[PDB]
Amino acid sequence: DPRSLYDLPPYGDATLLYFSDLHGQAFPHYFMEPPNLIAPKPLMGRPGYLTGEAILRYYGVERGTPLAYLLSYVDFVELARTFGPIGGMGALTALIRDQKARVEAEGGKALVLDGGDTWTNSGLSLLTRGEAVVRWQNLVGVDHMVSHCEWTLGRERVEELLGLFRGEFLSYNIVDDLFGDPLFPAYRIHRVGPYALAVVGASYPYVKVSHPESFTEGLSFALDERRLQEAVDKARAEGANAVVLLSHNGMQLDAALAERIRGIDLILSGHTHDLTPRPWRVGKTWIVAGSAAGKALMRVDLKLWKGGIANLRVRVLPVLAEHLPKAEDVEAFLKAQLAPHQDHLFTPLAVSETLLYKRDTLYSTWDQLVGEAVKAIYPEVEVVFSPAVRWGTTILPGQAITWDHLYAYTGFTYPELYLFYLRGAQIKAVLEDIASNVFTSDPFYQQGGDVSRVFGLRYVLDPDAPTGERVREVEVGGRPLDPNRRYLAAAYGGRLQRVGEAKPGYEPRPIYEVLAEYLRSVGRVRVRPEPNVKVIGRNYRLPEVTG
Amino acid sequence: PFRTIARLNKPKAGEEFRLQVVAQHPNEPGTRRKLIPAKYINEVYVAEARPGPSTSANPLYAFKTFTIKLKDTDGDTGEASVK
Amino acid sequence: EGEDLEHLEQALKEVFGKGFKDLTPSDAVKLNMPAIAESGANVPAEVEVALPKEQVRAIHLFADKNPTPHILAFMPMKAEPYYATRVRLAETTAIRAVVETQDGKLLLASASTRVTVGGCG
Ligand SMILES: [Mn+2]
Ligand SMILES: [Mn+2]
């Protein structure tokens, strides 16, 4: 194949250069799709839960193609050396500029839309408090954006960064706590020749329960179906023909809103970190996923009519630095921004012998390394609870782990590792609480990422089982779980420390400081995929860690 | 002792209107913890409302010249007037 | 889902008299509440039904898992049946909505409000 994916013929009146969940990934790295996306029986086989060979057959993607490397985990190690690294702010800007140049030469309108989760969770982000990410958006020319993890910086910082942001921030759900007045506009109407296109902004509704309440004090994020319908109806009344929803509510929740809310013709879903080469049809609305770490740019060419979208062309463009031109302005910007932090962020700490992936529903190799790192420094710890966050990176066999990779994996604004005692009954109740939230038949009752990976214990999981029966046969350290016994637990980037009794003498310190202390001392890491979970009625897939 | 804010949600003839009532009071159920003493608000002049102990701090009241009165456990009447 | 038949029946007898089995299921009464509550204390609760103002007698809300099940009591004499409101919740509780009428029959409307912990993904 001559990788001619970018060279596309003219289509429609409008074009939306959409990308989501970049998470401040400034440099070209690797990001493997989850090997398993376990869903309950009524939600099996639908987009957002497809993995491996199943996702390739569904969209008709051939094995060994550039799209196959981005969509599936199958032959990832083999294709990562072949197609090179994905993402990077320089490679992403170069692709957006190239595609915007094509659309404008044809005679159409091109809109650059960001799908939230951009300003935080990286090396470049933490050192500038999300400022360098906002300044990059002005360089590329982002028209609109949404939020979720942007609020982790604090209310004062977000308001400060929005003033620097040249584009227009859109949100309908972000309202005041005491009254309920929207601080940001719900939508924006753009003139696309004889037609008018409206872009409705939707932010994550469970923002207050995801990160500490102090960051979003005096704000309401809650999902309002009445306010969403009113925003769509007001847009069409003003003169808009088609309605496009820039959302971060989650692909599953957006699909539930597609059958409940009228007027929406297209939904640009984020938060779930999914990929869609073909648009998902739910009722009378097309759903396009926004990917993760900026590995893909979704070009949505729209043909518009008097009552919405007539037809559409969805093309997932792979952001490959090895096959894309150089955006020297962004490269000079990133070099100047991280000039005194070059010897910190890029100096190798340890060389990995096996593949280190983050994305999965129950178990990942990177989270086992975190569990091994905590247990090596602190041998008193019996269980290491790791957050199942969708954002991160992937370490290839032979590739060295640097400080930038640690900030890409554990780049929380609250990275404090807490050592606290938990009762056996609490550990079982917590695992059941996440399972009832992740494996829910109704997409409305879904919150956060995946099921939290706990190193030290082994358990049998049944997703189709009722609440309080999903988690069974729990065994801590090769011995069955005693509900009265006090087990020492270690957790970071959560709220588990609130219900647990804190360890005396211990002071909470950042997780990346603990990880670097382990990596520098060992020199080399050999983490083999050993799943501590047994799924009932589902086949748990395992990727190739060698190559 | 009490702070009350009232606002209408221009009303068109025939169509149904909304009344937004909000007051600055720290509502406590008593169960939350040292133990915090229970202090909560437990009326329109057409419609009477009596909330229980489980009420959030600084709550919102929705109803479909206006004078409103709110009484609590201690005895602090909350009055607000709107045209 | 936060169903607790033991604590709910204790409040229904001391306030009204009739238990859970005596309550009649209904589809007309709609209860608008979020699936997952953003705050432990600040939780929005909306209730509305399409029927004449004269027919309305009393509107009540109850929490199963909460120690104190009594949430609120609203009697609209001349006003239309409607009450968004912020009420406290202890844990994963299913909020029940009951409407009293002149006929004698008690209407039902069930909706669950989950209280969970997570991380920014
Ligand atoms: Mn995300
Ligand atoms: Mn997100």
Question: Can you walk me through this structure?
Answer:
Chain C: GO terms for molecular function: metal ion binding. Chain C: Keywords: Metal-binding, Signal. Chain C: This is SoxY protein. Chain C: Mn(2+) binds at residue 121. The complex is a heterotrimer of chains A (547), B (83) and C (121). In chain A, 28% of the residues lie in helices and 22% in strands. Chain A has 16 helices and 27 strands. In chain A, the strands form seven sheets. In chain A, strands 6-7-9-10-12-11 form a six-stranded mixed β-sheet, covered by helices on one side. In chain A, strands 16, 18, 19, 23, 24 and 25 form a six-stranded mixed β-sheet that branches. In chain A, strands 2-1-13-14 form a four-stranded mixed β-sheet. In chain A, α13 (365-377) packs across α16 (511-522). Chain B has one domain: Immunoglobulin-like (Sandwich), CATH 2.60.40.10. Helices cover 0% and strands 35% of the residues of chain B. In chain B, the strands form two sheets. Chain B has a three-stranded antiparallel β-sheet, with no helix packed on it. Chain B has a two-stranded antiparallel sheet with strand order 5-6. With 121 residues, chain C is mainly beta. In chain C, 9% of the residues lie in helices and 35% in strands. Chain C has one helix and seven strands. Chain C has a four-stranded antiparallel β-sheet, with no helix packed on it. Chain C has a three-stranded antiparallel β-sheet with strand order 1-2-5, with no helix packed on it. The longest helix of chain C has 11 residues, at 5-15. The relative contact order of chain C is 0.28. The A-C interface holds A 120, 148-149, 152, 177, 180, 205-211, 213, 220-223, 225-226, 271, 273, 387-391, 412, 433-434, 437, 442, 444-445, 447-449, 467, 493-496, 498 and C 1, 32, 34-39, 42, 44, 84, 92, 112, 114, 116-121. β3 of chain B pairs antiparallel with β4 (70-76) of chain C. Bound molecules: manganese (II) ion (2 copies). The site of one manganese (II) ion has 6 residues of chain A, from loops. Residues 21, 117, 271, 273, 390-391 of chain A line the site of one manganese (II) ion.
